Design a protein around this ligand. Structure first.
Ligand code: NAG
Lengths: 48, 48, 48
């Protein structure tokens, strides 16, 4: 997904919890949520 | 040398009493099941 | 994914007890039947 921000704009944050649909990859790996795994997150600015 | 050859033993009406397969015994026919056997699959999915 | 990790330090070898060592997890901790302790009267101000 993407995150919006810029030097001119001021502080912000969401109280709620953004939700993402991740069923297909779990079905692919045959990995139930209770099994052993982890996530890896990468963040990259627009300017590269 | 085989793709246009009758395929045993479904040619014989005495051996096999089902006329449809006997008529469609040509191995060329197996690809055109959609137009000769009209049986389909639920989905072309494979491992999600 | 956070209610699955082993509960330190109860997974160590410095655990004098043997029963909780192998089921010192978050999911299996929701039942007190295997922990052998029980309550007398769990009523709330006499309201049940
Ligand atoms: C891209 O923007 C970030 C904003 O923090 C900045 O730190 C970084 O130096 C910028 N890089 C380039 C190549 O513009």
């Amino acid at each position: 997904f993407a995150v919006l921000g810029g030097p001119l704009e001021m502080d912000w944050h969401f109280d709620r919890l953004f939700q993402y649909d991740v069923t297909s990859v779990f079905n692919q790996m045959h990995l139930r949520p209770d099994s052993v795994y982890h996530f890896d997150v990468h963040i990259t600015a627009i300017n590269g | 040398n085989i793709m246009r050859q009758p395929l045993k033993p479904f040619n014989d009406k005495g051996q096999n009493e089902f006329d449809l397969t006997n008529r469609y015994s040509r191995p060329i026919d197996v690809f055109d099941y959609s137009n000769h056997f009209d049986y389909h699959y639920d989905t072309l999915n494979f491992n999600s | 994914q956070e209610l699955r990790q082993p509960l330190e330090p109860f997974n160590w070898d410095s655990n004098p007890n043997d029963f909780i060592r192998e089921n010192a997890r978050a999911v299996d901790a929701f039942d007190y039947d295997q922990f052998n302790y029980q309550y007398d009267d769990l009523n709330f101000h006499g309201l049940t």
